[PDB]
């Protein structure tokens, strides 16, 4: 693609510069180019990929929610609100499809270690979840089940291969809980997952260094925040 002529190391360096400059669309394009070099990604590099696309799709989702709310109030005028909501929606779907394409070609199939495989399967669940937030057609149930299946495989691996305080295990459980609550209309499952994840992490904190303790308790607090919101 457009980044084919740039060195992998230069793409990674520029992704870090783009993050410092809060230029997340550039950051995502640089990291897409780095993935397309065909080599596996390091821990740090996977984080850069995730940060970049999370910020891009995060702005699109926030805009879509603003426009969808205006559209709902309008249907309680002309086609413009629907048209512009559709424009933002299509761009969001394009970004999600791009990320899912990188995971499928070929990040997931080459990811053998628990840390990388769970990371990418969590990403796959997340981006199918973002597709599910805007879905309304014949394939909406299949989109939801694609999110569920990816989260579920990641959960099964993380429970077998990682300690309960592992940050990627915690962040996966957090997001699968949000999937249950917001997408699958399963609030009891969401609450049960968040509580069991929190409690089993709490019991494993004694094994950690001060720095690992900080990392794990930060994500546990997000689980606690959702539990307080939901109960």
């Amino acid at each position: 693609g457009a980044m084919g002529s740039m060195e992998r190391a230069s793409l990674i360096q520029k992704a870090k510069l783009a993050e410092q400059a809060e230029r997340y669309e550039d950051m995502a394009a640089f990291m897409k180019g780095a993935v397309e070099k065909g080599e596996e990604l390091s821990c740090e590099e996977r984080n850069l990929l995730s940060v970049a696309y999370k910020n891009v799709v995060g702005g699109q989702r926030a805009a879509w929610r603003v426009l969808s709310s205006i559209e709902q109030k309008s249907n309680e005028k002309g086609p413009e609100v629907r048209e512009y909501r559709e424009k933002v929606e299509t761009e969001l779907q394009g970004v999600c499809d791009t990320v899912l394409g990188l995971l499928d070609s070929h990040l997931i199939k080459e990811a053998g270690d628990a840390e990388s495989r769970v990371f990418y399967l969590k990403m796959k669940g997340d981006y199918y979840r973002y597709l599910a937030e805007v879905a309304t057609g014949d394939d909406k149930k299949r989109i939801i089940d694609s999110a569920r299946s990816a989260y579920q495989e990641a959960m099964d691996i993380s429970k077998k291969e990682m300690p309960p305080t592992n940050p990627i295990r915690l962040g996966l459980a957090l997001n699968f809980s949000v999937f249950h609550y917001e997408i699958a209309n399963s609030p009891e499952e969401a609450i049960s997952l968040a509580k069991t994840t929190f409690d089993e992490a709490m019991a494993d904190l004694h094994t950690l260094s001060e720095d690992s303790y900080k990392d794990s308790t930060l994500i546990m607090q997000l689980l606690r925040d959702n539990l307080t919101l939901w109960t």
Binding site: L174, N175, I219, L222
Partner: peptide, 8 residues
């Protein structure tokens, strides 16, 4: 409000 998914 909307719930927290993982965020930095």
């Amino acid at each position: 409000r909307r719930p927290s998914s993982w965020r930095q």
